Design a protein around this motif. Sequence first.
Motif, PDB file in Angstrom:
ATOM      1  N   UNK A 164     -38.910  36.024   3.662  1.00 55.19           N
ATOM      2  CA  UNK A 164     -40.278  36.057   3.145  1.00 55.19           C
ATOM      3  C   UNK A 164     -40.911  34.713   3.467  1.00 55.19           C
ATOM      4  N   UNK A 165     -41.912  34.711   4.334  1.00 56.56           N
ATOM      5  CA  UNK A 165     -42.707  33.517   4.638  1.00 56.56           C
ATOM      6  C   UNK A 165     -43.953  33.605   3.760  1.00 56.56           C
ATOM      7  N   UNK A 166     -43.993  32.755   2.748  1.00 51.51           N
ATOM      8  CA  UNK A 166     -45.126  32.829   1.810  1.00 51.51           C
ATOM      9  C   UNK A 166     -46.377  32.122   2.274  1.00 51.51           C
ATOM     10  N   UNK A 167     -46.257  31.271   3.251  1.00 50.79           N
ATOM     11  CA  UNK A 167     -47.386  30.425   3.604  1.00 50.79           C
ATOM     12  C   UNK A 167     -47.818  29.624   2.400  1.00 50.79           C
ATOM     13  N   UNK A 168     -49.085  29.206   2.434  1.00 53.95           N
ATOM     14  CA  UNK A 168     -49.522  28.232   1.420  1.00 53.95           C
ATOM     15  C   UNK A 168     -49.776  28.827   0.048  1.00 53.95           C
ATOM     16  N   UNK A 169     -49.680  30.156  -0.081  1.00 57.50           N
ATOM     17  CA  UNK A 169     -49.635  30.792  -1.391  1.00 57.50           C
ATOM     18  C   UNK A 169     -48.348  30.521  -2.159  1.00 57.50           C
ATOM     19  N   UNK A 170     -47.315  29.996  -1.508  1.00 61.98           N
ATOM     20  CA  UNK A 170     -46.029  29.708  -2.149  1.00 61.98           C
ATOM     21  C   UNK A 170     -45.713  28.224  -1.960  1.00 61.98           C
ATOM     22  N   UNK A 171     -45.273  27.585  -3.048  1.00 59.61           N
ATOM     23  CA  UNK A 171     -44.880  26.185  -3.064  1.00 59.61           C
ATOM     24  C   UNK A 171     -43.382  26.016  -3.205  1.00 59.61           C
ATOM     25  N   UNK A 172     -42.914  24.865  -2.735  1.00 60.85           N
ATOM     26  CA  UNK A 172     -41.506  24.516  -2.813  1.00 60.85           C
ATOM     27  C   UNK A 172     -41.106  24.182  -4.249  1.00 60.85           C
ATOM     28  N   UNK A 173     -39.808  24.290  -4.513  1.00 65.16           N
ATOM     29  CA  UNK A 173     -39.338  24.082  -5.892  1.00 65.16           C
ATOM     30  C   UNK A 173     -39.596  22.688  -6.441  1.00 65.16           C
ATOM     31  N   UNK A 174     -39.605  21.666  -5.595  1.00 68.54           N
ATOM     32  CA  UNK A 174     -39.839  20.313  -6.097  1.00 68.54           C
ATOM     33  C   UNK A 174     -41.299  20.019  -6.412  1.00 68.54           C
ATOM     34  N   UNK A 175     -42.212  20.927  -6.080  1.00 72.31           N
ATOM     35  CA  UNK A 175     -43.627  20.652  -6.259  1.00 72.31           C
ATOM     36  C   UNK A 175     -43.972  20.458  -7.736  1.00 72.31           C
ATOM     37  N   UNK A 176     -44.943  19.559  -7.969  1.00 70.63           N
ATOM     38  CA  UNK A 176     -45.381  19.161  -9.288  1.00 70.63           C
ATOM     39  C   UNK A 176     -46.839  19.502  -9.555  1.00 70.63           C
ATOM     40  N   UNK A 177     -47.496  20.162  -8.616  1.00 69.05           N
ATOM     41  CA  UNK A 177     -48.874  20.569  -8.784  1.00 69.05           C
ATOM     42  C   UNK A 177     -49.071  21.574  -7.670  1.00 69.05           C
ATOM     43  N   UNK A 178     -50.261  22.133  -7.604  1.00 69.18           N
ATOM     44  CA  UNK A 178     -50.512  23.267  -6.731  1.00 69.18           C
ATOM     45  C   UNK A 178     -51.078  22.840  -5.382  1.00 69.18           C
ATOM     46  N   UNK A 217     -36.830  32.197  -6.464  1.00 67.60           N
ATOM     47  CA  UNK A 217     -37.324  31.315  -7.527  1.00 67.60           C
ATOM     48  C   UNK A 217     -38.603  30.586  -7.126  1.00 67.60           C
ATOM     49  N   UNK A 218     -38.843  30.405  -5.825  1.00 64.28           N
ATOM     50  CA  UNK A 218     -40.064  29.757  -5.390  1.00 64.28           C
ATOM     51  C   UNK A 218     -41.286  30.499  -5.879  1.00 64.28           C
ATOM     52  N   UNK A 219     -41.203  31.833  -5.988  1.00 67.84           N
ATOM     53  CA  UNK A 219     -42.366  32.599  -6.407  1.00 67.84           C
ATOM     54  C   UNK A 219     -42.715  32.310  -7.866  1.00 67.84           C
ATOM     55  N   UNK A 220     -41.736  32.414  -8.774  1.00 62.92           N
ATOM     56  CA  UNK A 220     -42.026  32.112 -10.173  1.00 62.92           C
ATOM     57  C   UNK A 220     -42.427  30.638 -10.359  1.00 62.92           C
ATOM     58  N   UNK A 221     -41.766  29.730  -9.649  1.00 68.10           N
ATOM     59  CA  UNK A 221     -42.118  28.313  -9.745  1.00 68.10           C
ATOM     60  C   UNK A 221     -43.564  28.095  -9.337  1.00 68.10           C
ATOM     61  N   UNK A 222     -44.010  28.779  -8.272  1.00 63.97           N
ATOM     62  CA  UNK A 222     -45.393  28.686  -7.842  1.00 63.97           C
ATOM     63  C   UNK A 222     -46.341  29.126  -8.934  1.00 63.97           C
ATOM     64  N   UNK A 223     -46.059  30.282  -9.547  1.00 63.21           N
ATOM     65  CA  UNK A 223     -46.921  30.735 -10.643  1.00 63.21           C
ATOM     66  C   UNK A 223     -46.963  29.686 -11.738  1.00 63.21           C
ATOM     67  N   UNK A 224     -45.806  29.080 -12.049  1.00 64.68           N
ATOM     68  CA  UNK A 224     -45.760  28.105 -13.129  1.00 64.68           C
ATOM     69  C   UNK A 224     -46.603  26.877 -12.825  1.00 64.68           C
ATOM     70  N   UNK A 225     -46.455  26.299 -11.615  1.00 63.42           N
ATOM     71  CA  UNK A 225     -47.231  25.105 -11.282  1.00 63.42           C
ATOM     72  C   UNK A 225     -48.724  25.393 -11.181  1.00 63.42           C
ATOM     73  N   UNK A 226     -49.097  26.594 -10.750  1.00 61.94           N
ATOM     74  CA  UNK A 226     -50.514  26.929 -10.653  1.00 61.94           C
ATOM     75  C   UNK A 226     -51.101  27.079 -12.045  1.00 61.94           C
ATOM     76  N   UNK A 227     -50.373  27.770 -12.943  1.00 65.31           N
ATOM     77  CA  UNK A 227     -50.852  27.929 -14.317  1.00 65.31           C
ATOM     78  C   UNK A 227     -51.034  26.574 -14.991  1.00 65.31           C
ATOM     79  N   UNK A 228     -50.124  25.628 -14.741  1.00 64.56           N
ATOM     80  CA  UNK A 228     -50.226  24.323 -15.400  1.00 64.56           C
ATOM     81  C   UNK A 228     -51.330  23.467 -14.786  1.00 64.56           C
ATOM     82  N   UNK A 229     -51.568  23.628 -13.489  1.00 58.47           N
ATOM     83  CA  UNK A 229     -52.727  23.016 -12.859  1.00 58.47           C
ATOM     84  C   UNK A 229     -54.005  23.526 -13.504  1.00 58.47           C
ATOM     85  N   UNK A 230     -54.177  24.854 -13.566  1.00 59.08           N
ATOM     86  CA  UNK A 230     -55.346  25.447 -14.222  1.00 59.08           C
ATOM     87  C   UNK A 230     -55.523  24.906 -15.638  1.00 59.08           C
ATOM     88  N   UNK A 231     -54.445  24.871 -16.419  1.00 54.82           N
ATOM     89  CA  UNK A 231     -54.494  24.299 -17.763  1.00 54.82           C
ATOM     90  C   UNK A 231     -54.568  22.767 -17.733  1.00 54.82           C
TER      91      UNK A 231
END
Length: 231
Positions: A164-178, A217-231
């Motif tokens: 699965x190549x997510x492109x920029x819709x998916x972030x790496x696990x070490x990411x701290x923001x979106x 896990x990259x998919x759920x991690x992406x959702x998490x970092x995006x939600x926290x960015x929004x918040x």
Amino acid sequence: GEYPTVNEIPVGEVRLYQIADGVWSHIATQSFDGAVYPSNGLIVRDGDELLLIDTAWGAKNTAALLAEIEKQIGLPVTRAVSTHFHDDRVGGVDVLRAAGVATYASPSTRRLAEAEGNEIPTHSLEGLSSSGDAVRFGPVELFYPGAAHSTDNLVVYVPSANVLYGGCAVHELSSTSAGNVADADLAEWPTSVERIQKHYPEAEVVIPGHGLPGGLDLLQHTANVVKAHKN
Ligand SMILES: C[C@@H](OCc1cnn[nH]1)c1cccc2c(-c3ccc(CS(C)(=O)=O)c(F)c3)c(C(=O)O)[nH]c12
Ligand SMILES: [Zn+2]
Ligand SMILES: [Zn+2]
């Protein structure tokens, strides 16, 4: 042998990384607004030809990409797909087109690239305009998950390898923001990620648009970092 990073990638050079049989990522680095970033794309064997996903972020990087593919693989790149309109996906399309590569993107990506002054793929990919749409393109499936990092972002699945190549819709696990959210829809992004997770539950390798591949896990991690960015 480890996944390449900038520390190993001066801007202008390109490295390949074997992901699976007939599947590589490409990694290059670029300066933007005074900082240096890595970025990924994909290469998929298509019999005795290659399908390229995304440029290497710039004209000189993309020329270096073609030379690295000739050195490491030795099969001709015949087609390329750009997964959204930003320069890390279409910057280098003019190089590809002058090297005989047929360049493709959705009509949405083509319109956004033209409006922003970025390089424009030649051919339009129909059948991708509604979220959840999928089409075959050589050895991959292209999937439009909905608006996320950008309104036009596409995802690419390699069914032979469950890559699965997510492109920029998916972030790496070490990411701290979106990442770079200039063109993002933070409210829709989690819904779009959920669509990816529902569509490709057997993905074994997940590749982000920037940074290290991992698993689902990259998919759920992406959702998490995006939600926290929004918040
Ligand atoms: C080519 C361009 O795309 C944006 C754009 C906007 N308008 N035109 N182009 C671009 C230029 C410069 C940087 C980026 C990043 C980025 C990615 C990850 C991180 C680390 S992190 C996930 O922990 O935050 C980050 F800090 C920035 C992205 C992307 O996130 O995809 N796109 C970038
Ligand atoms: Zn982008
Ligand atoms: Zn990006």
